[PDB]
């Protein structure tokens, strides 16, 4: 086709930026866009190319941005070979014939400081790493086999060492007519490779046959499950690690372990005539017993096992860590209770869940390095709770809290209250808290020792959006950190929508980095002007929704 209408902006990182997009309708179900983006501080034109396509394999979008030379980057890195910057992005997803599944999520940048300097369309300055994943899968009603590759480019210059699966094959098989029992089998073959040439490399082969007997009534349910876990590890390039650590990794490792889990739920109902005529209240208790014997996993390097968050839903999870490198022993009982309140039309209006985990014996993975605030090992250690209340068709409220006895404090908490008359007219308040003890426990040591990490999280966010005269839309957002008493994100936006065009003016002041010299955060102020031509589509919205997604902390509908 032809040229699009240009847009512009002023930022504190690039001064005046001018965009000159050009559309290119190459054919049906595939088009392209070429954008010269002139930046004045760097004094050069970033050539951006976008390619959107549809095909039998699915739908995909590619992006390639290239800046041949940079002035700020040249000044900051005088000994660098070249100052060119580039970005490659590819997002593809498709299902062919209902059985073949293709997924691609690939992002690559020249340097870790790319997203702090340029616009955030497929990336962001809040991202800590870039993901490069390919996956091809074959799925039928009782079978699925997926082969995928995962690589990660880490931006933080603390430790660039990372692990990648190249490749990882997962196989799942099911059979639900083996007498009264339901059986399934899971298998995996993974190759772990590290970017550094001195880190260990591994090959893991895992098998997991599980058999479960479910039983149900109109008022109760009970499911028993027995599973076996067989894992074989082949580890190489482990001379360097063994040379400095007392704990020695083994080349060939075999880990065989059973697991027994019994879950049960009850449902009680009553007609809450005291509060409202015809309203129903359901009290659902739930219990679970989990037993997995200890296995010394100190001679297996941790490649993809990390501690998992324990919300109310996560209290009944059968695993403490993701992946399969660390499998903590367990002799525990989880007990929870959920109360729901339905109106006359059988529509759920209120729910509140509270649960806890009781440990009969300590959960040991063989290699215990977590730094807790106390030496509590057995007893009611983990408590979780959540609530969701629909006060009306416009008011909604959500909340969640997680308390851990070993931290001697509330581990995490979050809350939000939203009013929403329509897509355009809305207000929302939210709060997020993560204690410093939780940050120290479930993160690296330099997180605990860093000034920008050790304070934890205490963030209060306000969002508002209102239309005026059926043609103007005003959107505002303000996220503020109570610990430092400093703003984290701030955004304003005004859009005027007409019959054939829409004019949008936006402004955002956001946290953008850290100044190690003076030890204070860096803020990036941007203000952009963008006009778009209407009339070619039935879209007559006021633009509030995509304006609310512009900032680094995008709006999410909590109903």
């Amino acid at each position: 086709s032809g040229f699009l209408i240009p847009n512009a902006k002023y930022t504190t990182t690039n001064y005046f930026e001018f965009y000159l997009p050009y559309y290119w309708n190459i054919a049906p179900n595939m088009d392209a866009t070429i954008t010269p983006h002139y930046m004045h501080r760097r004094g050069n034109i970033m050539w951006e190319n976008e390619f959107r396509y549809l095909s039998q394999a699915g739908a995909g979008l590619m992006e390639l941005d290239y800046l041949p030379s940079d002035k700020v980057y040249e000044d900051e890195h005088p000994n660098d070979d070249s100052s060119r910057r580039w970005l490659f992005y590819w997002n593809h997803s498709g299902v062919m014939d209902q059985v073949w599944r293709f997924n691609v999520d690939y992002t690559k940048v020249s340097d870790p400081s790319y997203f702090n300097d340029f616009d955030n369309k497929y990336g962001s300055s809040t991202d800590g790493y870039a993901t490069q994943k390919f996956s091809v899968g074959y799925a039928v009603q009782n079978f699925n086999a997926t082969v995928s590759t995962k690589q990660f480019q880490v931006f933080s210059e603390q430790n660039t060492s990372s692990y990648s699966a190249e490749p990882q094959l997962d196989v799942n098989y099911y059979q639900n007519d083996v007498g009264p029992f339901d059986t399934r089998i899971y298998g995996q073959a993974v190759h772990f490779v590290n970017t550094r040439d001195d880190m260990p490399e591994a090959t893991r082969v895992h098998l997991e046959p599980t058999i479960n007997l479910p039983l149900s009534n109109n008022w109760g349910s009970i499911n028993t499950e027995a599973k076996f876990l067989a894992t074989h590890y082949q580890q190489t390039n482990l001379d360097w690690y063994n040379s400095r650590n007392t704990t020695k990794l083994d080349e060939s490792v075999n880990r065989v372990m059973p697991q027994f889990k019994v879950d049960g739920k009850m449902v009680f109902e009553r007609d809450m005539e005291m509060l409202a005529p015809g309203y129903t209240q359901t009290l659902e208790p739930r219990a679970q017993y989990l037993y997995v014997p200890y296995r010394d996993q100190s001679d297996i390097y941790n490649y993809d096992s990390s501690l998992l968050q324990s919300d109310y839903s996560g209290l009944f999870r059968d695993r403490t860590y993701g992946g399969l490198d660390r499998i903590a022993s367990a002799n525990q009982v989880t007990t929870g209770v959920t109360s729901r309140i339905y109106d006359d039309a059988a529509v759920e209006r209120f729910n509140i869940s509270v649960g806890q985990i009781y440990y009969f014996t300590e959960s040991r993975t063989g290699d215990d390095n977590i730094t807790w605030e106390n030496d509590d090992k057995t007893g009611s250690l983990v408590w979780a709770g959540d609530t969701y209340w629909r006060i009306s068709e416009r008011w909604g409220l959500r909340g969640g809290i997680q308390y851990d006895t070993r931290l001697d404090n509330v581990a995490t908490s979050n809350s939000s209250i939203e009013y929403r008359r329509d897509e355009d007219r809305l207000v929302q308040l939210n709060y997020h808290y993560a204690s410093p003890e939780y940050i120290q426990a479930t993160l690296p040591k330099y997180y605990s020792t860093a000034e920008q990490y050790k304070n934890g999280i205490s963030q209060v966010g306000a969002v508002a959006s209102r239309p005026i005269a059926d043609r103007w839309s005003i959107v505002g957002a303000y996220y503020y950190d109570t610990n430092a008493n400093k703003q984290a994100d701030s955004m304003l936006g005004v859009q005027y929508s007409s019959c054939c065009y829409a004019i949008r003016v936006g402004y955002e002041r956001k946290l953008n980095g850290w100044d190690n010299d003076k030890q204070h955060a860096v803020y990036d102020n941007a203000i952009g002007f963008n006009i778009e031509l209407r009339g070619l589509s039935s879209n007559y919205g006021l633009g509030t929704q995509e304006m609310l997604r512009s900032n680094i902390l995008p709006y999410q509908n909590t109903l």
Binding site: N254, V256, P258, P293, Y294, R295, D299
Partner: peptide, 16 residues
């Protein structure tokens, strides 16, 4: 690793 005498199907702590 493991021990001198261990059972693959054990159900006990140290593969007893």
């Amino acid at each position: 690793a493991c021990r001198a005498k261990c059972d693959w199907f054990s159900w006990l702590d140290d593969c007893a």
